Structure formats: structure tokens, C-alpha cells
Amino acid sequence: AMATAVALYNFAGEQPGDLAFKKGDVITILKKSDSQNDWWTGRTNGKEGIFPANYVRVS
């Protein structure tokens, strides 16, 4: 099934297409790369968008 990750920090998701979340939220990964320097794509509590990979820890 899809990868999931725990948010290590808040992210305000302030630009278009971003996913906002809070520390401790469980993010469903829609698509990721193999790198911590990239922008990954996720979903949490009914919204979706992009966020910095290093803000989460894949479970």
C-alpha cells in the first residue's frame, strides 16, 4: 500500500500547491523521490499537496 510518514515539524504550506501540516501528523505519501532535498507529494486530513521531504520520517 502507500507509504506513510510522520511529520517531524510544522509546515505552513503557504505557496500554491503546498500541503500544510503539524508536527506529529501522519502524511500519506502520494509520490516521493529518494532524496531529502526534494519536494514530495502527500495527503493528510482531506488535503493534498507538496512539502519538503526532510520535514517527515517515513514509517
Side-chain angles (χ1 to χ4, degrees):
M2 285 193 270
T4 53
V6 184
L8 302 172
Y9 312 101
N10 307 314
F11 178 52
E14 73 283 357
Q15 306 191 7
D18 287 355
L19 179 72
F21 52 74
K22 304 287 187 42
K23 181 180 185 176
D25 289 350
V26 178
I27 309 313
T28 291
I29 306 298
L30 302 187
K31 191 164 178 71
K32 61 180 279 297
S33 72
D34 312 301
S35 163
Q36 291 293 111
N37 311 316
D38 288 333
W39 287 80
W40 289 357
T41 304
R43 177 162 65 195
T44 190
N45 301 139
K47 290 174 305 236
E48 314 160 313
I50 67 162
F51 62 92
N54 66 317
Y55 280 52
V56 310
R57 177 177 307 154
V58 176
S59 301

